[PDB]
Design an enzyme around this catalytic site. Structure first.
Site, PDB file in Angstrom:
ATOM      1  N   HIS A 351       0.905  -1.137  -0.036  1.00 14.48           N
ATOM      2  CA  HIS A 351       0.001   0.050   0.071  1.00 14.48           C
ATOM      3  C   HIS A 351       1.012   1.428   0.017  1.00 14.48           C
ATOM      4  O   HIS A 351       0.341   2.431   0.195  1.00 14.48           O
ATOM      5  CB  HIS A 351      -0.690  -0.129   1.177  1.00 14.48           C
ATOM      6  CG  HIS A 351      -1.951  -1.120   1.199  1.00 14.48           C
ATOM      7  ND1 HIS A 351      -3.172  -0.944   0.436  1.00 14.48           N
ATOM      8  CD2 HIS A 351      -1.766  -2.134   1.800  1.00 14.48           C
ATOM      9  CE1 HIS A 351      -3.974  -2.086   0.869  1.00 14.48           C
ATOM     10  NE2 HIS A 351      -3.184  -2.828   1.403  1.00 14.48           N
ATOM     11  N   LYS A 542      -8.572  14.057   4.662  1.00 13.29           N
ATOM     12  CA  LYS A 542      -7.756  12.776   4.724  1.00 13.29           C
ATOM     13  C   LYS A 542      -6.540  13.190   5.716  1.00 13.29           C
ATOM     14  O   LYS A 542      -6.562  14.026   6.482  1.00 13.29           O
ATOM     15  CB  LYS A 542      -6.982  12.643   3.481  1.00 13.29           C
ATOM     16  CG  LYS A 542      -5.970  13.867   3.192  1.00 13.29           C
ATOM     17  CD  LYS A 542      -5.941  14.130   1.769  1.00 13.29           C
ATOM     18  CE  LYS A 542      -5.734  13.075   0.931  1.00 13.29           C
ATOM     19  NZ  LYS A 542      -6.697  13.309  -0.361  1.00 13.29           N
ATOM     20  N   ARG A 543      -6.116  12.139   6.347  1.00 12.18           N
ATOM     21  CA  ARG A 543      -5.038  12.115   7.384  1.00 12.18           C
ATOM     22  C   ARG A 543      -3.960  13.090   6.939  1.00 12.18           C
ATOM     23  O   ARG A 543      -3.635  13.290   5.939  1.00 12.18           O
ATOM     24  CB  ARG A 543      -4.278  10.730   7.581  1.00 12.18           C
ATOM     25  CG  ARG A 543      -5.255   9.755   8.467  1.00 12.18           C
ATOM     26  CD  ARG A 543      -5.726  10.251   9.805  1.00 12.18           C
ATOM     27  NE  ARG A 543      -4.687  10.083  10.693  1.00 12.18           N
ATOM     28  CZ  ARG A 543      -4.116   9.312  11.639  1.00 12.18           C
ATOM     29  NH1 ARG A 543      -4.912   8.106  11.535  1.00 12.18           N
ATOM     30  NH2 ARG A 543      -3.063   9.186  12.120  1.00 12.18           N
ATOM     31  N   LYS A 548       0.911  14.378   1.482  1.00 15.74           N
ATOM     32  CA  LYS A 548      -0.573  14.789   1.056  1.00 15.74           C
ATOM     33  C   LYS A 548      -0.646  16.379   0.681  1.00 15.74           C
ATOM     34  O   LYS A 548      -1.526  16.811   0.200  1.00 15.74           O
ATOM     35  CB  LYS A 548      -1.528  14.420   1.869  1.00 15.74           C
ATOM     36  CG  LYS A 548      -1.668  12.706   2.310  1.00 15.74           C
ATOM     37  CD  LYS A 548      -2.535  12.481   3.240  1.00 15.74           C
ATOM     38  CE  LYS A 548      -2.661  10.993   3.585  1.00 15.74           C
ATOM     39  NZ  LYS A 548      -3.135  10.298   2.473  1.00 15.74           N
ATOM     40  N   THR A 650      -8.242   6.857  -2.070  1.00 17.50           N
ATOM     41  CA  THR A 650      -9.650   6.233  -2.107  1.00 17.50           C
ATOM     42  C   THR A 650     -10.456   7.006  -1.861  1.00 17.50           C
ATOM     43  O   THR A 650     -11.792   7.422  -2.462  1.00 17.50           O
ATOM     44  CB  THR A 650      -9.983   4.895  -1.219  1.00 17.50           C
ATOM     45  OG1 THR A 650      -9.560   5.457   0.317  1.00 17.50           O
ATOM     46  CG2 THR A 650      -9.186   3.959  -1.540  1.00 17.50           C
ATOM     47  N   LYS A 654     -14.446   8.558  -3.903  1.00 20.45           N
ATOM     48  CA  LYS A 654     -15.599   9.107  -2.965  1.00 20.45           C
ATOM     49  C   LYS A 654     -16.183  10.325  -3.585  1.00 20.45           C
ATOM     50  O   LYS A 654     -17.475  10.535  -3.824  1.00 20.45           O
ATOM     51  CB  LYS A 654     -15.668   8.970  -1.730  1.00 20.45           C
ATOM     52  CG  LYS A 654     -14.968   7.648  -1.086  1.00 20.45           C
ATOM     53  CD  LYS A 654     -14.560   7.810   0.118  1.00 20.45           C
ATOM     54  CE  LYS A 654     -13.860   6.597   0.793  1.00 20.45           C
ATOM     55  NZ  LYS A 654     -13.194   7.144   2.401  1.00 20.45           N
TER      56      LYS A 654
HETATM   57  N1  C3B Z   1      -0.176   2.253   6.629  1.00 21.65           N
HETATM   58  C1  C3B Z   1      -0.703   2.592   5.611  1.00 21.65           C
HETATM   59  C2  C3B Z   1       0.005   2.299   4.306  1.00 21.65           C
HETATM   60  C3  C3B Z   1      -0.638   2.898   3.235  1.00 21.65           C
HETATM   61  N2  C3B Z   1      -2.123   3.548   3.429  1.00 21.65           N
HETATM   62  C4  C3B Z   1      -2.811   4.010   2.317  1.00 21.65           C
HETATM   63  O1  C3B Z   1      -3.516   2.624   1.893  1.00 21.65           O
HETATM   64  C5  C3B Z   1      -4.757   3.215   0.654  1.00 21.65           C
HETATM   65  C6  C3B Z   1      -5.578   1.751   0.447  1.00 21.65           C
HETATM   66  O2  C3B Z   1      -4.753   0.912  -0.520  1.00 21.65           O
HETATM   67  C7  C3B Z   1      -4.148   3.742  -0.299  1.00 21.65           C
HETATM   68  O3  C3B Z   1      -5.142   4.141  -1.399  1.00 21.65           O
HETATM   69  C8  C3B Z   1      -3.505   5.118   0.008  1.00 21.65           C
HETATM   70  O4  C3B Z   1      -2.773   5.671  -1.125  1.00 21.65           O
HETATM   71  C9  C3B Z   1      -2.102   4.727   0.942  1.00 21.65           C
HETATM   72  O5  C3B Z   1      -1.609   5.500   1.462  1.00 21.65           O
HETATM   73  C10 C3B Z   1      -2.637   3.878   4.451  1.00 21.65           C
HETATM   74  O6  C3B Z   1      -3.549   4.049   4.612  1.00 21.65           O
HETATM   75  N3  C3B Z   1      -1.787   3.062   5.745  1.00 21.65           N
HETATM   76  C1  PLP Z   2     -11.931   7.226   2.503  1.00 20.51           C
HETATM   77  C2  PLP Z   2     -11.443   7.592   3.903  1.00 20.51           C
HETATM   78  C3  PLP Z   2      -9.809   7.949   4.099  1.00 20.51           C
HETATM   79  C4  PLP Z   2      -9.013   7.730   2.918  1.00 20.51           C
HETATM   80  O1  PLP Z   2      -8.874   8.958   2.093  1.00 20.51           O
HETATM   81  P1  PLP Z   2      -7.829   9.262   1.209  1.00 20.51           P
HETATM   82  O2  PLP Z   2      -7.923  10.641   0.663  1.00 20.51           O
HETATM   83  O3  PLP Z   2      -7.621   8.328   0.154  1.00 20.51           O
HETATM   84  O4  PLP Z   2      -6.463   9.159   2.125  1.00 20.51           O
HETATM   85  C5  PLP Z   2      -9.357   8.335   5.051  1.00 20.51           C
HETATM   86  N1  PLP Z   2     -10.263   8.505   6.113  1.00 20.51           N
HETATM   87  C6  PLP Z   2     -11.595   8.332   6.053  1.00 20.51           C
HETATM   88  C7  PLP Z   2     -12.472   8.368   7.256  1.00 20.51           C
HETATM   89  C8  PLP Z   2     -12.343   7.788   4.736  1.00 20.51           C
HETATM   90  O5  PLP Z   2     -13.626   7.675   4.759  1.00 20.51           O
END
Ligand code: C3B
Ligand code: PLP
Ligand code: C3B
Ligand code: PLP
EC number: 2.4.1.1
Lengths: 810, 810
Positions: A351, A542-543, A548, A650, A654
């Site tokens: 990942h 996102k986190r 990012k 992901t 969405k």
């Molecule tokens: N420890 C980790 C390593 C990868 N990722 C994440 O996994 C998702 C699902 O494949 C990816 O779409 C994302 O780009 C990646 O950073 C994560 O949330 N936590």
């Molecule tokens: C979909 C989702 C994520 C993943 O988001 P990315 O922008 O792909 O990192 C993270 N947190 C929550 C709560 C989500 O629903």
């Protein structure tokens, strides 16, 4: 009320109401005179749960009778969110329940807000597991999700003085109606001890025992009467544990701490002993359960024909040496046969490519905690390198590069190398990511075993991420093409023939406006904050992480602000910039980024000259339930990671499915999304992966951009001088220093093109009709990103099983 | 099957069966193909529980409407045992459930054995609380039991190599179907901090907060449709607790350890901080709950008219200063008024006179943990002593003797003195015990306030201790005098007119024989041990303690053995001597006594010459469920504590009600039992309290008895020489040394008379008819010992409320 929510038959509504009252009375032991909203939520949850049991029992009986190949998805994270509405959607009980509670004088939406999120994940990786379980059940696969039942999931984020504060996520406080404890299936897990070599085989002795108690949660497929299982293990001490008296009993907590809390790191490795224990705990208990089920179907040659184990990243990588341990030490199979079975059984999904995220465990830790497993790993390494040496004679550096054992200050085991060696398939999560794996970090492995490498582009479930969170959009779509697309998202392409349909254009734009109004009201309700529903909703959720680049977003925001202050009476498209996400507790830069965001808001949101033309809000406690609210309300989706860093992403999918246009780099799945919708319907900008490489070869010098871009220079000077932190002029010194001297993610390099691209976004928003037509082209081509497509590919190309859409008798 | 077990109507049996299947399916999520006996037990438990809810809800609504005076019974122990059968008995569902499960193809007795005991107590004190709750519900009192929900109750006792081994009592492992969590009523409890004196009143600040979560368990009255509540508190940490990140979450255990485990001491005080925290925890949460309920009925003058707080020993004594704290510091009442209310509200029950059992907390502990409470205690002491000084001018020693504060190495607070000062009533638990309180340890207090001192002789509930554990006896009794005696035990006197009835004599003897056969079978079933059902069952079951003198019993056993070895071919009445009970983990002498008992059995049970004439068995893991089995099977009840040490005793009452004759000293309730049945129908022996005093004044010299009693000397020599411990000749040196040089309980002084009395027992057993006639006279006069009589006296003479036998509408 709406079509896609099912029928509200007279018989069903009557039955739901009586069962609702039955549970309130007999289950909650309350009456309508003392019942609180929480009481009503539970009465409803138990009522809905009852509808699951019959199907749950016969689905499992079915798998017993037919004995199909079983899929075991091992993950340390399952970011489930709420379960009530999802269950109603998949069982087609939503309108019936809504009508029933309505007749009982209650608002179901109000009751749904009472359910705590099952936050057993950090972000994308954990959410993917959740979407996958939904798709596997919907595709009729005999799949089981295996993980840990954390007492405390991801922490609840509070914002104090603009800083993130963390508090325990005590999600089980009021109880969990969805789970079913199965103490009868408790299994023992071993730790420490030592290896004894006897006449026939090695023995692992003098170990400390910790019990693994399973809790089962039902996973309903979409209207097919299939209900799979997610089994989460809980740690329990044996009763003879540490058996003054009082202390021995109190020390039971030592063993039970294994399942106490989820490590809050996103894309970052922390080599702590407790974490290693969690990883082995889930693997050991799960494998025993798998073998037990297999024997209750000696002939381990058929093991790979009846079992498939998918490793969600390297977190459960110990499954490889643990499977070997059991087959060799316990079942007495010869090494070669045991290895053959293991390889054909295991598959590994990578990942990320970030170096700090890869698991590399210190040998001294494994040596003390799992002595037998270390020996097995060395043996695996020895035989693997012999194969490499025979394929590339004399290439000594390749040998050291591919070793599972890394030398240096402290010897470590590269878990990723372990996973590739012991798996018959290794996949990336987006086309570009999978290609990067073969060209860079796993290049040596790809040259040795090219056939092992595959791609499986991620996806999201259209049930939770469309029907559940955006019923208004699902409805207008169903009105035109039916309901079939919900379990066959590719059908959305038929919407392409409505791009010029004036009625549809109006309905799409109306649904979005309604979502924005509803979210704008929510912000004032639970967070007391005013925002203009007419402005463009620019959101990045996102986190928080440097890759990012939430910082690049901040730079744009400050640019917009300075431009307004420069030409106050000039017109600009109004914007509400929303940024949200949690920062790992020990990630200092991430915490400083959150502070910067709030500080910018403090200035921008109170400047009279700006007015309602620009607002910057930090969305507190971003989690699954909040995502279901803000995503349907967004106009612009920010996916701006530095090219080559976001494996897939992901959240981007969405937003695309819910009517938002995307501004982003050619990174992760963004590439395939733009390819599906057409680059002209996407706002792409910045360096491509090749451009980043060129810059690295030459050397990235941020000073150069600072010297040649006046607007950028002004921003940095504002930050440095304390413009955004009056009382603490040097509060953001760390951020400036990083940006100027050691920015691994080249924020400045994409600044100019980013700002320019954003102008093109504002230009399009000024033309309602054309903005909506572009939105329609995005929604219509988002079909490929359904997790049903992803899982069907995993099923056929990796697990070797055929997906099924056939219903089971209810 | 039998009358007293209720009717098995067609409608009821049908309804029970369908609800049984409903729970197995919907609640346990299982089918008849995979269900185990445990699954069936739970299906039955939930089915029976459902019948409780309706009554439980309306009983509480009833108390709300009528607003009668509320009785709050505070105890740190509630020795409940199993709940399934008791619930069926009180709801008259036993025969119906038996028939229903029978038709479903299941044996209900088998299912009842699966339920874990709720062992939240150590012995007599805890069991008394359990019997009291049953009687209060049966007498229609608006009573609430308040305690702590220990995660681990009294430890399970295992015997290894003849030694006691302890293991955690994880009674909640499979879940508790009887309790209902009420997280909505969680309350905060404060610890540590400091006192701040402001303009208006003192303030307790900078405290650490621990949450108290209540769990409610229903307490059904006997066939009167009344269902009271037992509320047990569980400790929970606040979510901002200690809020690196991981450690803070893990440290939540620190706060939650408060309700983790029951201190395993019987009649012994251990001054540990954790124990003090438990005592305040239960008191603080309970008082807030009480005041809340009171306000939801400002005028605290009526508080005593609506509230009664009974302190089960001094364990919850902090209720006195806590009530003062709330009224003074929080409600702002003046001291004098607050004190008046407190005194009229609280009542204290003393359960022992042993010095080592009295609570005397070090001032430094209270000072650090509860600073405000220490100040209040000093103020209480100051005003109390001023009253003493005014009543006995110049008597300085009385002042130091009555002080709540004891001087010396370390200052301590005498909790018993605190309880007497702040209560309007103080009672002993048996006539002789209450008299001893006034003549000795509380003499000064009695002279100051004679009106406060009362007696309330203990009792046991005839539901659990007759109908439930001995249906065969309850039936033959009901056949002659009806079923009314079950809730009016005095009616058993009518049995006196059947003492010459040949039919009854035969039935009484038959029921006993059946019980012995059933127990003899049980010993081989779960413990694999052979015993002669024709022998006299000589049993002593109770916690192991030197004052209970299990050692005197051992001496008799060894005497019997030596006499047989001396004259092998001489006839002697066969006996099976059963001794059981747990020893506190840190009580060395008690553990050595258990070892001695098993060692004696090792020799006696394998001596060919003895044969089946004498057997010595140690009953492992004695608890409530085991008591319900062995007591109905006993012929001889051993109640041989040194006169003046057993406050009352309750096991003695259980044996008397079930057909066993009693051999004992004139101690505790034994005196009143002999008085009720007639001394000629009791086997009394040994020193009376006055004789013990005379011996102490003169000086107890064990050597004297050793020199003048050849048989006793022989026993001591056998012990010393290793006759009972071949491989370890000096294994019992500690026991011999204690007996010979520092026996606080004068074992030797009662030896001769004890052995002589035992001969008289054997003589009577040789005459079946006359033995049974004496048994009938005992059963017929055991009415006074029903806890319904005890509670009715507490109600009228202390709480000021009238008991009611009236049924509530079902
Ligand atoms: N420890 C980790 C390593 C990868 N990722 C994440 O996994 C998702 C699902 O494949 C990816 O779409 C994302 O780009 C990646 O950073 C994560 O949330 N936590
Ligand atoms: C979909 C989702 C994520 C993943 O988001 P990315 O922008 O792909 O990192 C993270 N947190 C929550 C709560 C989500 O629903
Ligand atoms: N800590 C204590 C103090 C007294 N007791 C006991 O209480 C019961 C009930 O009143 C008495 O009958 C018994 O004589 C006494 O030892 C006990 O079990 N535990
Ligand atoms: C009745 C009972 C007791 C009290 O017995 P005594 O002989 O009065 O000390 C102790 N333990 C259990 C399990 C009981 O049922």
């Amino acid at each position: 009320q709406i079509s896609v929510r099912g029928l509200a038959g007279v018989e069903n509504v009557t039955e739901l109401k009586k069962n609702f009252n039955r549970h309130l009375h007999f289950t909650l032991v309350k009456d309508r005179n003392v019942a609180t909203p929480r009481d009503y939520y539970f009465a409803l949850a138990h009522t809905v749960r009852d509808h699951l049991v019959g199907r749950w029992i016969r689905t499992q009986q079915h798998y017993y009778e037919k004995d199909p190949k079983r899929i075991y998805y091992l993950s340390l994270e399952f970011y489930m969110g709420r379960t009530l509405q999802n269950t109603m959607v998949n069982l087609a009980l939503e309108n019936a329940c809504d009508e029933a509670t309505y007749q009982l004088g209650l608002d179901m939406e109000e009751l749904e807000e009472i359910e705590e999120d099952a936050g057993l994940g950090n972000g994308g990786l954990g959410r993917l597991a959740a979407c996958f379980l939904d798709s596997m059940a919907t595709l009729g696969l005999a799949a089981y999700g295996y993980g840990i039942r954390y007492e405390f999931g991801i922490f609840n984020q509070k914002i104090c003085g603009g800083w993130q504060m963390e508090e325990a996520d005590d999600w089980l406080r009021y109880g969990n109606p969805w789970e079913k404890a199965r103490p009868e299936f408790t299994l023992p897990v071993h730790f420490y001890g030592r290896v004894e070599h006897t006449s026939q085989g090695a023995k692992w002795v003098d170990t400390q025992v910790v019990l693994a108690m399973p809790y089962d949660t039902p996973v309903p497929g979409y209207r097919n009467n299939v209900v799979n299982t997610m089994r989460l293990w809980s740690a329990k001490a044996p009763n003879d544990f540490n058996l003054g008296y009082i202390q021995a009993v109190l020390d039971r907590n030592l063993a039970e701490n294994i399942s106490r809390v989820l490590y809050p790191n996103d894309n970052f490795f922390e080599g702590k002993e407790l974490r290693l224990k969690q990883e082995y705990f889930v693997v050991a208990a799960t494998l025993q359960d798998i073998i037990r089920r297999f024997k209750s179907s000696t002939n381990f040659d058929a093991f790979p024909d009846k079992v498939a184990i998918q490793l969600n990243d390297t977190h459960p990588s110990l499954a490889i040496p643990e499977l070997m341990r059991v087959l060799v030490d316990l079942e007495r199979l010869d090494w070669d046969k045991a290895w053959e079975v293991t390889v054909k059984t295991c598959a590994y999904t990578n990942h990320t490519v970030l170096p700090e995220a890869l698991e590399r465990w210190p040998v001294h830790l494994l040596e003390t905690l799992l002595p037998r497993h270390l020996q097995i790993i060395y043996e695996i390494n020895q035989r693997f390198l012999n194969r490499v040496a025979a394929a590339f004679p004399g290439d000594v550096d390749r040998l050291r590069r591919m070793s599972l054992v890394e030398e240096g200050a402290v010897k470590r085991i590269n878990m990723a190398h372990l996973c590739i060696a012991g798996s018959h398939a290794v996949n990336g999560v987006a086309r570009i990511h999978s290609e990067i794996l073969k060209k860079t970090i796993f290049k040596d492995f790809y040259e040795l075993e090219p056939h092992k490498f595959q791609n499986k582009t991620n996806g999201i479930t259209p049930r939770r991420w469309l029907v559940l969170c955006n019923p208004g959009l699902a409805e207008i779509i169903a009105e035109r093409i039916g309901e079939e697309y919900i379990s066959d998202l590719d059908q959305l392409r038929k919407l392409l023939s409505y791009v010029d349909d004036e009625a549809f254009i109006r309905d799409v734009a109306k649904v979005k406006q309604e979502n924005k109004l509803k979210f704008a009201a929510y912000l004032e309700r639970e967070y007391k904050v005013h925002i203009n529903p007419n402005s463009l909703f620019d959101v990045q959720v996102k986190r928080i992480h440097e890759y990012k680049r939430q910082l690049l977003n901040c730079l744009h925001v400050i640019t917009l602000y300075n431009r307004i202050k420069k030409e106050p009476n000039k017109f600009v498209v109004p914007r509400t910039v929303m940024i949200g996400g949690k920062a790992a507790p020990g990630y200092h830069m991430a915490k400083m980024i959150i502070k910067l965001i709030t500080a910018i808001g403090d200035v921008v949101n109170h400047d009279p000259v700006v007015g309602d033309r620009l607002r910057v809000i930090f969305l507190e406690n971003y989690r699954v339930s909040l995502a279901e609210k803000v995503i349907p309300a967004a106009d612009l989706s920010e996916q701006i990671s530095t090219a080559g860093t976001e494996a897939s992403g992901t959240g981007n999918m969405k937003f695309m499915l819910n009517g938002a246009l995307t501004i982003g780099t050619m990174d992760g799945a963004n590439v395939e999304m733009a390819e599906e919708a057409g680059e002209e319907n996407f706002f792409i900008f910045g360096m491509r992966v090749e451009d980043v490489d060129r810059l690295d070869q030459r050397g990235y010098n941020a000073q150069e951009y600072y010297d040649r871009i006046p607007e950028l220079r002004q921003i940095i000077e504002q930050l440095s001088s304390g413009f955004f932190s009056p009382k603490q002029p040097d509060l953001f010194k760390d951020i400036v220093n990083m940006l100027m001297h050691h920015d691994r993610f080249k924020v400045f390099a994409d600044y100019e093109e980013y700002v320019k691209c954003q102008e093109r976004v504002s230009a399009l928003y000024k033309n309602p009709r054309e903005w909506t037509r572009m939105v329609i082209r995005n929604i219509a081509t988002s079909g490929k990103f359904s997790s049903d497509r992803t899982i069907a590919q995993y099923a056929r190309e990796i697990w070797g099983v055929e997906p099924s859409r056939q219903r089971l008798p209810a």
